[PDB]
Amino acid sequence: GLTGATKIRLERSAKDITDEIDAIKKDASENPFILEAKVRATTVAEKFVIAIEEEATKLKETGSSGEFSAMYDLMFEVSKPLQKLGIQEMTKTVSDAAEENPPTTAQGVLEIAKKMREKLQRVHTKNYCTLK
Amino acid sequence: QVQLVESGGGVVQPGRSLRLSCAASGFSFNTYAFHWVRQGPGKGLEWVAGISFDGSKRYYADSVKGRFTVSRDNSKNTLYLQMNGLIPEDTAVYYCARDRRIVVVSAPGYWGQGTLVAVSSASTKGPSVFPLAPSGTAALGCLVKDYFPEPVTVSWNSGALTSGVHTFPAVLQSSGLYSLSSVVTVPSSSLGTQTYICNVNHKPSNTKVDKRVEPK
Amino acid sequence: DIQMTQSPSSLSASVGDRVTITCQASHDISNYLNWYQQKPGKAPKLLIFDASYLETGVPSRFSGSGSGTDFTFTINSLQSEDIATYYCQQYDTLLSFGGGTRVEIKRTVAAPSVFIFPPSDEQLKSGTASVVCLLNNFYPREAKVQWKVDNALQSGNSQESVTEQDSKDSTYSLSSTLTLSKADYEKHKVYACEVTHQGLSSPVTKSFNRGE
């Protein structure tokens, strides 16, 4: 699947989401903890989607079908702990986008990543603005 | 048109090794992840192993972790399951399944027919086939007796006869060998004009037997 | 791990009823839950995915609901062909199935058709005689098969096999096999099969005479 720095960067950025979620899960909607967790998780998750976008662009002319599909596989995997935090249809968002634009090319991964980033931003904005 | 065909089932002595394979055609084999699911006789489904679309991630149930390994070969479009140190609790019909979604590991969508693994020290024995002659509607059948291990398949008229067929579940006799009876109900008018033949197959012993059933 | 507990273990419903099955997950699994149907002799078939989404080609009468730990599977109007064992499956942590729910079909009482089969001449040459009694297309499953050789009741020399309930008429079929040696077969003449069922006003006996 993924090789080289693309493998290192994407895996680390995906692990940064699960580290923060595990941080919140044992650190200590109108609940001020659910609100802050969604803002925190979407911040680090968005960084991961940007890295997905950057690495796909870098691999546009040289990446293979299996490399790009592995980036979607990572996006699907990181959507599960994000959905368990209360961001519903997070998995469906990336899974439906993969059906419309299958991740066999860099452009296909970018389309998937665009919808994932947009979803993560709406959740980030709605929860942050509720803090007030 | 998706087909999945498992192979490699039969008798294996306890503590030995057995390998299972699964053919793919026809779909994009490299797109999908695959699963192994087994079902003991009369028991429920147990997810055993899974492998991602690339072979970079392999997952195993706690009951088989450290003892089973699953692999794929995209060039041959086949999925593999290595079973080491077999125990009688591994006796089951093992199903190879393709994932419902592309790329990701979510759920077994398309299944194979399954192959039966019998973890036993008993010897493989082919069955003896005897006719059940008939005497409105008349009934006739075949008696498949004294075989090991499961299963046997019984078709009528090489599959042409489908209505009224009742192939009974196999019973385990005191001898340790399996017995089964398959019967069919046909009009008594079609007794001296329609030939009724049952096709008995026992793959572990290479027993292809066709027996004519006629009234006495 | 994640423990999936399914309920009920089995149920009996009539054609047209609304059947409901529950899965419970030991931990939160969001909606990473699927529902499978395994008809007798067949491989499992996915009916509902992601706990509420009907798979393409599945009849509308099947549905699913739930998120988190409690899940529900429903058959709006149960059909005879719907007899199967239903399994939930989670994919939150690895994959695992529930214990399954057996769905049987309640129908009207049906009496069995009783047939008697003597041992074949070919098998008799081996030194063992098997006499087969067939109970065809009856409901309910509960039946009593008595073997009588020269009016003598038999026990311990027979084994019963019952087919799964039929997908079309929801009836069962039973086979009883009377096995004895060739020497014992040729020592007696009358071979009787007394059957008792809820659908018979009085027990039905099917008999033959050896060679006749």
- Decide: helix, strand or coil at residue A25: helix
**Measured between alpha carbons, how far is C157 from C131 in angstroms, rounded to an integer?**
11
CA-based angle B51:B92:B41, to the nearest 5?
A: 140
Interface test with B, best of A69, A74, A105 (most B CBs within 10 A): A69
Q: How far is CA B128 from the centre of its chain?
A: 20
Residue of A nearest to B52 (CA): A73
Nearest CB among A84, A91, A92 relative to C28 is that of A84
C43 vs B113: CB contact, 8 Å cut-off?
Answer: yes
Closest CA to A81 of A30, A126, A42: A42
**DSSP annotation string for A65-114:** HHHHHHHHHHHHHHHHHHHHTT-TTHHHHHHHHHHHS-TTSHHHHHHHHH
Cβ pair A84:C50 closer than 8 A: no
Distance CA(A66)–CA(A108), nearest Å, equals 12
> Resolution of the experimental model in angstroms, please?
2.5
Ramachandran quadrant class, B15 (left: phi over 0; alpha: psi -120 to 50; beta: rest)? left
How far is C71 from C50, CA to CA, in rounded Å? 11
- Tokens for A37, please give them: 């967790």
Selecting from A65, A66, A76 the residue whose C-beta is nearest the C-beta of B104 gives A76
As a whole number of angstroms, the distance between CA A11 and CA C158 comes to: 64
Rounded CA-CA distance B35/C186 in Å is 55
Hunting for tokens 């498949």 — which residue is that? B144
DSSP secondary structure letters along B131-197: EE----EEEEEEEEEEEBSS--EEEEGGGTB-TTEEEPPPEE-TTS-EEEEEEEEEETTTTSSS-EE
Please indicate if any CB of chain C lies within 8 Å of the CB of B183. Answer: yes
Cβ-based contacts of C50 with chain A (< 8 Å): 92
The 3-state DSSP class for residue C59 equals coil
Token pair, residue B89, equals 């609790």
**Residue among B161, B164, B162, B181 nearest B173 (CA):** B181
Tokens 């994009």 label which residue? B28
Task: Mark which residues 77-116 of B lie under 8 Å from A by CB.
Answer: 101-104
Nearby residues of C147 by Cβ (< 8 Å), 6 or more positions away:
C131, C133, C153, C154, C157, C158, C176, C178, C191, C192, C193, C194
CATH match for A4-131 among 2.60.130.10, 1.20.1420.40, 1.10.8.60, 1.10.645.10: 1.20.1420.40
Q: Same topology for domains C4-106 and C113-209, yes or no?
A: yes
Interatomic CA distance for residues A48 and A39, integer angstroms: 15
Name the residue among C168, C21, C16 with its Cα closest to residue C81: C168
Angle between helical axes of A65-84 and A4-25 (0-180°, round to 10): 0
Residue contact B102–A102, C-beta within 8 A: yes
Q: Which residues contact C26 (CB under 8 A, 6 or more apart)?
A: C1, C2, C3, C4, C5, C69
| Whole-angstrom distance, CA of residue B153 vs CA of residue B198 | 10
Number of H helices, E strands in chain C: 2, 19
Beta carbons of A83 and C30 less than 8 Å apart: yes
Q: Which residues of B touch C91 (CB under 8 A)?
A: 105-107
CATH number for the C113-209 domain, one of 3.40.50.280, 2.102.10.10, 3.40.50.300, 2.60.40.10?
2.60.40.10
| Cβ B59 vs Cβ C94: under 8 Å | yes
Structure tokens at B68: 């089973």
**Which residue in the block uniquely carries the two structure tokens 């008594």?**
B188
Cβ atoms of residues C84 and C104 within 8 Å:
no
* Residue C3: DSSP 8-state: -
3-state class (DSSP) for residue A54: helix
The answer to whether B166 contacts C123, with C-beta atoms less than 8 Å apart, is: no
For chain C, which residues make up each domain, given as ranges? 4-106, 113-209
Q: What distance in Å separates the CA atoms of residue C59 and residue C56, rounded to the nearest whole number?
A: 9
Q: Report how far Cα C35 is from the mean position of its chain's Cα atoms.
A: 21
The architecture of the domain spanning C4-106 is Sandwich (2.60)
Q: Tokens at residue A125, please?
A: 């904005």
For chain B, list the domains and their CATH numbers.
Answer: 5-119 (2.60.40.10), 128-213 (2.60.40.10)
Check CB contact under 8 Å for C97 and B132.
no
**Exposure string over A62-92, b if 16+ CB within 10 A, otherwise e:** ebeebbbbbbbbbbbbbbbbbbbbbbeebbe
A61 min Cα distance to partner chain C (Å): 35
User: Quick one: tokens of A81?
Assistant: 């702990």
Q: What's the maximum distance between 2 C-alpha atoms anywhere in chain C?
A: 70
Give the CA distances from residue A36 to residues A85, C75, C90, C119, in Å, rounded to whole numbers and listed in that order: 11, 41, 29, 79
- CA dist B191 and B180 (Å) reads 24
Q: Give the Cα-Cα-Cα angle B107, B111, B117 (nearest 5 degrees).
A: 110
